[PDB]
Amino acid sequence: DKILGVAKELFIKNGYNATTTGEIVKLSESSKGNLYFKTKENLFLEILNIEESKWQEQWKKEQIKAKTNREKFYLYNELSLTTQYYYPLQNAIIEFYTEYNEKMNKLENKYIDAYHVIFKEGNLNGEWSINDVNAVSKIAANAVNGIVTFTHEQNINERIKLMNKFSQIFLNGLS
Amino acid sequence: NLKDKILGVAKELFIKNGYNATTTGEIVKLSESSKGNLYYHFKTKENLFLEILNIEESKWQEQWKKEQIKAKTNREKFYLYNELSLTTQYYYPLQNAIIEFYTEYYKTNSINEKMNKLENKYIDAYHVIFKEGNLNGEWSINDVNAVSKIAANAVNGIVTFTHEQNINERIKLMNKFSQIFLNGLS
Numbered sequence: 505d506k507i508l509g510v511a512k513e514l515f516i517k518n519g520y521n522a523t524t525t526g527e528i529v530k531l532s533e534s535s536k537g538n539l540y541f542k543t544k545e546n547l548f549l550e551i552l553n554i555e556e557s558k559w560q561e562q563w564k565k566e567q568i569k570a571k572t573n574r575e576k577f578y579l580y581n582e583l584s585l586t587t588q589y590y591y592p593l594q595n596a597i598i599e600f601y602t603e604y605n606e607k608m609n610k611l612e613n614k615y616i617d618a619y620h621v622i623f624k625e626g627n628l629n630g631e632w633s634i635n636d637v638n639a640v641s642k643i644a645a646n647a648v649n650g651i652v653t654f655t656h657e658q659n660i661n662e663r664i665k666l667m668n669k670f671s672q673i674f675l676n677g678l679s
Numbered sequence: 680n681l682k683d684k685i686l687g688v689a690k691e692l693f694i695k696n697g698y699n700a701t702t703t704g705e706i707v708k709l710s711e712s713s714k715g716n717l718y719y720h721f722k723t724k725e726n727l728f729l730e731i732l733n734i735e736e737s738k739w740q741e742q743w744k745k746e747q748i749k750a751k752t753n754r755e756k757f758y759l760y761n762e763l764s765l766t767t768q769y770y771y772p773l774q775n776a777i778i779e780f781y782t783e784y785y786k787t788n789s790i791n792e793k794m795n796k797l798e799n800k801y802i803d804a805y806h807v808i809f810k811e812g813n814l815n816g817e818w819s820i821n822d823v824n825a826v827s828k829i830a831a832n833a834v835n836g837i838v839t840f841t842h843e844q845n846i847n848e849r850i851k852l853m854n855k856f857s858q859i860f861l862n863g864l865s
């Protein structure tokens with residue numbers, strides 16, 4: 505945990521490659537032997553799992569505010585911009601994909617799961633008629649991740665504005 | 680020419696060994712130039728890499744001006760541009776030295792300003808697609824500058840975060856997105 509906490513801080517601030525197990529160990533005393541997650545990957549892939557969940561929990565605690573699935577969608581994407589979980593590691597996560605199908609598969613599904621529920625319960629609630637949810641969930645998720653990640657610099661309220669103009673276009677698109 | 684040769688050699692070096700690993704001395708010696716001349720044209724490795732990127736955007740835009748003839752309507756151009764963005768990046772060699780470079784100088788605003796200059800140039804492609812689409816009545820976007828930024832960044836996310844998939848599927852999705860997106864505009 506002293507490892508897992510320092511890593512997150514190092515992976516968020518500096519890169520994936522730019523923070524190595526040398527600097528992580530020196531950051532939390534616990535000697536290199538203690539770091540045995542097997543590889544640097546495993547350490548990192550474990551953090552993503554943690555953070556993806558800390559987000560997914562926060563989303564459940566905050567989705568009550570949404571009455572309809574339409575609102576659930578809008579909101580989920582809005583919250584993605586503001587959260588302190590997962591989405592601030594996406595630079596690392598990108599840098600990770602270049603530098604290297606396993607525990608990754610269980611994450612990518614947990615990552616799209618929030619949209620799966622929304623679109624599934626959305627068909628049950630009759631708000632739209634999407635027939636291939638897995639496609640639309642992976643699309644929506646990644647598009648959103650794009651809007652969050654490829655604008656992390658400019659004014660936060662513009663960001664929120666853009667994401668909502670997105671959510672509108674997308675949902676309107678499905679229906 | 681020694682500006683171009685520096686750029687060209689630098690590009691290959693970056694492609695070959697990444698951004699961080701490539702030194703200025705390498706670029707210098709391999710291009711039969713000088714640290715002095717490199718400094719006079721680019722000041723830093725960071726800027727040198729930025730001009731490499733400026734060129735690559737210019738080259739990209741040229742591809743698009745030629746490639747977009749295969750797309751008659753702006754609806755078609757939107758579909759295409761997104762495919763290209765996905766496909767052409769899949770085998771883009773600088774893409775790794777870009778990721779490296781970005782996830783390093785994005786906290787620095789002097790650089791990040793110049794990188795948005797670049798990224799805005801990419802967004803411009805969508806701005807044109809949407810604008811001409813308004814003029815042709817393929818759709819009615821009142822807020823084009825926003826919709827462009829969205830399209831571009833939605834496609835970037837699809838391009839970048841899909842990674843765990845087969846390349847024939849990604850195209851399927853990217854086109855599905857292209858479909859869904861356009862069909863929520865009118």
Ligand SMILES: Cc1cc(N)c2ccccc2[n+]1CCCCCCCCCC[n+]1c(C)cc(N)c2ccccc21
Binds near residue numbers: 653654736
């Ligand atoms: C040649 C060429 C070839 C292509 N297939 C191509 C495809 C799409 C766009 C440009 C292309 N170009 C042109 C490439 C010119 C360079 C401009 C793009 C770099 C600007 C930074 C973009 N960026 C931002 C904003 C935010 C991020 N978190 C981030 C993370 C990782 C990587 C990039 C990031």
